[PDB]
Symmetry: D2
Subunit: 325 residues, 4 copies
């Protein structure tokens, strides 16, 4: 009756949302995995009544032993890549190691946080390890005969990125620090195409999307899921923020990738991601058109499966600004 | 063989209507103008179009010039008389023509229209440029003589980018670079999700009216939105930048009270649009599906002549910038 | 501060949903209007704690006095038209009389249950009083200079038509009586165009749309609102029913309107169907059929009620899941 | 001038590809066939297209017959060898050709593909008609030599109405009248919202392959759904009825066990439809069914061809108005397709 689901990164944003969503369904038993059960965040997960296991993804045997009995697993990696991984050893990423360990432990159903490979799609003329490592994990999971289901889920930009101070530093004053001309100014290169920039409130929605996948894993196997709460251009984001907060805001694109300030190291290292996205006419996920219909179908299903508990629709940018500003 | 009188055939809207209808042998175009010796009048003559001289302000003359018309397209001008400006919308030459068409027994009417901000805002707003046409719309909707009366509502013309005064007031976009090197567009937000409608008046509007005349009964009393593309002002600028590789940006006029130097009294229109959450047409959501259908229908009625699809903002920039 | 709203037909389906929706917002006070406060349905409302006033729409003066003090009014009419109304004299329908009474009483904000006029749209070819009676009221209210806001709202096919017996008899066994070959068969003419048939759960959704309008009446003045919960073809409706209930169902079109059973109200429905086909299925007459606006209004009411109820409209799949997998066929409707 | 080899150029898919690309001076169409003396091979020759003779089952000859190609469009046939029917998907002549194209150094590939029901369902389904093409898709996606590899996935052809086995097996629609005077279509539901995709293979498909070749890098490793219209089976029949004024209807096989499964291809189609219903109608497996991209690849080819032809895809209504309203005797029901009985 009861299906156990191991949650990687349960102390983190993606896995944290996953754990919080799945625990609200009696058909599932959540086994959070963390490196330190004494962690501040781990104790918060232990206050929700969640089973907590301590293990390190870089230890395949220990990980395999910690996933022994899981019906499903949600896998993700971290913001910091090891030098070996940053230099093209994508098989050494702890997320990818965990996926292989799950194969050995016999876990039948996998939901894997993934990203497109700029290298694979551009014929080798681009290399963006931050994305390509997760894409490697997706290539391994899709080809593995052991799994009964492997579904890649691709996260959008978090709305919560607006709370990172260097975010405010890098991309113009937007959305907290106004400039000399009195504007909350956002400065980013265009995405390309029709400027269909995807955004999500990671906390409230991502976990419910993964939950919806686990409600019927066979239907979603080997079919990429885009975790998208809203789709709008940078300029529409600014006008929406201004309407909500009644604070002047504007968008000034970085049309020339070479003419971005070297003062900003998050613009210079992202210049290959931005170029790959532009080359793809803004189709940043690589599998097909950017659409949030599936996400709105995976959120409603989790809503029903949870007992009509919580919210039935994903958080839009307008609502996030109304709730956070 | 159905005869159609075309008001404003020397103008943008009526000109597109005449040029589109002429390519369907089932329809015979009778252009109406005040001056048949005009350059534009002669251009219409060079295409082999019948040109009759009449003034909309003369109901008696106009009734005589419409006799025998199966249908009529009606439009007015940018110029309102002081009397019309001050509320006597029955005197606008377009609405006079509509009443004359009723007198002459013309059975099928397509009327260039706009919503009445005054009527929709409970009196808060007064915009004669729109409300005058709305007067004709209600009159035609209530008139029992017509067999069909269909209102058509034009979006912003792309060709407004060629009006020097438009370039003057709304920033430099898309011709005049500013100090920081940007083609800058300065406009109040439309409201809602910034679904700003635009049309290439020359190539598409006439085809939409043509499509209406292909089945007047199905469109009677149903407003048609003449929309070629739907996008936000910022999308306009990013599209322009991609097409031309000329830096461009959008800086909204957030406060209609603190606008600059730039005496365009279109403020009440902008405020009414915002009050409608951007639903500038007033009848329902902004949609171009109907326009696309009508354009394709004209394409096929004309013999697969011309374009089957409406001109988008990107294509307009490609062809004119 | 607290805005009073009179609800016509509060004992009925449309007004009942309106009352039940506006009751959950303390900014509004619901004054139900009924002819008989002793009714089973009226006492149901009294048991819910709703003010009940007795008045008859056919009495303009009494109606005016009973509407006095209302900030807003929801107006609707009934399924049975007097013969005089049947033959024109649309001004005499109690809904339209009530609209004029509200104008006399000075009610500033109006939401009116409406439908397109086939006669006005067809150049006289068609005459369907079931629609045209409400269209008369719609134009009268649109032209009325006294109202501060006037919004016409138009109902789609109720899902609850499946509980109305007259629906079950004529339009095939669907969805309760299986037919000779074991099929739940629906027998109806095509709508026209791409078969974009609108449906709504009248009980749970219609009232929330009226509520959403009253939340910002100025923005909706003179703007037709389509009360649409789902848009799907008749065949898609039947296949969805089959998927939900694992019970055979099918759609049998009347391709020839002359071959449709027309044994007085079936004659008015033949003309209505012909008008819809003549409009390529654009049965509302003002523009394309769309449920986007309905969704916006439903969400707005959801928020206003304190995030109570559902944020989304009920689809055909949801309705079949809730009312067929598990329902007495005795609801109010056309008396054929 | 960039040369593109076209597999199956004498067939429906490759034929549309050749006819579309030839009208664009930036490309050279090199048709590939087993028999250059064929009556359909001579039609292509009458169009002014190079015709080379090679067999896909001969990897070396195929390699020498592709060398010099800037791009290649790859497709397979309706008949699979017994070895291929039984799993040996590497032996399908289309997949051998794909390996030959890498072998030959063709830098840009457009591969006719379908999802693998087995791969997506954890082994619950085995439908070689789709999975064979999916094998080639996986190989092309993983091959490091190609500069671009784009899978394109065909919908139901409207031209299935000209394939005789379709008319026989699936109730007779739209040509064979039944007891009650109905053109009856008999098919299981697709699943989900009955978003059945259809395309006019002749007029539209080639333009989509062409649009991909207009910017291969932007489409590399991105599945393209070749869709002209999206509608339910019942909507298909009612649309046909409106166009032709002939009674027509759709009678679903709600229970797949009640579908005629006399012959082996009908049972493999039962398993395919079961897979579709399993995926809630997502018959392509990569994502939602959509025709926006197809409408973007048709318009782009329209422009590339010199604004010649149609800018838009053919809808079901327009196809019925073009092929089933007039008698049009030249439209005979003899097209290549599944040979069931
Ligand atoms: N913020 C963004 O920009 C953004 C948006 C889009 C997508 N992404 C992508 O998603 C990833 C970051 O996701 P996130 O923000 O959820 O990360 P996060 O908040 O740091 O969570 C990742 C979790 O990984 C666990 N972990 C780290 N090293 C580990 C190891 N060696 N073994 C086992 N577990 C380990 C940590 O929890 P324990 O202490 O429990 O082990 C940590 O909480 C990156 O690839 C990023 O590019 C993020
Ligand atoms: N982008 C836009 O500005 C836009 C969009 C929405 C709607 N509109 C509205 O549509 C109108 C402008 O349309 P348009 O571009 O066709 O105007 P236009 O280019 O100025 O043409 C007006 C036409 O009316 C004719 N006319 C003028 N006075 C007349 C009279 N007294 N009797 C008879 N005919 C007369 C003119 O010359 P002849 O009489 O010599 O033929 C001409 O053919 C305005 O009301 C405007 O507000 C335009
Ligand atoms: N699915 C549909 O059939 C549908 C959808 C579109 C529009 N419509 C139209 O809407 C109308 C039916 O709506 P409904 O479902 O609400 O009808 P209903 O269930 O009969 O309710 C009508 C309401 O009006 C009240 N009423 C009836 N006669 C009255 C009178 N003379 N004076 C005052 N109040 C009176 C009734 O209350 P008491 O009984 O106590 O008065 C009742 O609450 C018809 O014109 C129909 O064509 C319905
Ligand atoms: N509606 C549909 O039926 C549909 C939908 C989606 C996709 N598909 C799939 O696509 C395939 C059908 O495509 P189609 O209509 O283009 O096929 P087709 O009409 O059968 O054409 C086959 C082509 O391939 C060539 N060929 C066949 N066997 C060969 C071999 N052993 N070696 C070399 N060449 C060989 C033929 O050579 P010659 O040049 O000598 O004739 C011919 O040009 C099937 O797998 C089908 O399942 C079709
Ligand atoms: C009258 C107006 C405010 C206006 N002022 C202008 C000043 C300069 C250039 C261009 C315009 C336009 C263009 C428009 C475009 N239209 C959109 C629907 C109705 C409306 C409003 C709008 C119109 O009448 N013409
Ligand atoms: C008059 C009608 C044909 C009708 N005949 C019926 C006869 C018996 C049962 C049920 C109905 C209904 C249902 C409807 C629902 N419709 C939604 C759009 C307006 C309209 C028309 C439509 C209506 O007013 N009642
Ligand atoms: C293999 C199949 C079940 C099939 N069986 C048939 C048997 C006889 C006639 C005609 C067909 C077709 C036509 C199709 C149409 N296509 C839609 C998407 C892929 C698919 C599935 C589908 C295909 O491969 N050809």
């Amino acid at each position: 009756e009861i299906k156990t689901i191991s949650v990687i990164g349960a102390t983190g944003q993606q896995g944290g949302s996953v754990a919080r969503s799945l625990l609200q369904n009696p058909e599932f038993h959540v086994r959070c995995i963390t490196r330190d059960t004494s962690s501040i965040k781990a104790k918060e997960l232990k206050e929700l009544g969640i089973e907590i296991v301590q293990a390190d993804g870089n230890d395949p045997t220990a990980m395999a032993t910690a996933l022994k009995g899981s019906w499903g697993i949600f896998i993700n990696n971290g913001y910091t890549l090891t030098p070996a991984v940053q230099n093209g050893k994508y098989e050494e990423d702890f997320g990818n190691v965990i996926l292989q360990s799950a194969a050995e432990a016999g876990v039948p159903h996998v939901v894997f946080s993934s990203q497109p490979s700029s290298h694979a799609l551009s014929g080798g003329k681009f290399n963006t390890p931050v994305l390509d490592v997760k894409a490697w994990g997706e290539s391994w999971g899709r080809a593995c005969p052991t799994f009964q289901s492997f579904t890649p889920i691709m996260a959008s930009w978090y709305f919560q990125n607006f709370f990172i101070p260097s975010f405010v530093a890098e991309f113009g004053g937007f959305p907290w620090n106004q400039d000399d001309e009195g504007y909350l100014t956002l400065r980013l290169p265009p995405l390309g195409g029709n400027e269909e920039v995807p955004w999500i409130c990671i906390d409230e929605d991502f976990g419910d999307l993964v939950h919806g996948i686990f409600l019927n894993p066979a239907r979603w196997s080997k079919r990429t899921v885009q975790a998208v709460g809203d789709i709008l251009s940078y300029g529409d984001l600014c006008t929406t923020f201004a309407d909500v907060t009644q604070r002047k805001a504007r968008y000034i694109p970085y049309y020339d990738l070479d003419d971005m300030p070297a003062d900003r190291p998050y613009l210079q290292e992202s210049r290959q991601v931005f170029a790959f996205y532009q080359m793809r006419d803004g189709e940043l996920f690589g599998n097909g058109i950017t659409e949030k219909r599936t996400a709105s179908l995976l959120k409603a299903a989790a809503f029903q499966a949870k007992g009509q508990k919580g919210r039935e629709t994903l958080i839009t940018a307008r609502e996030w600004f109304e709730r956070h500003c």
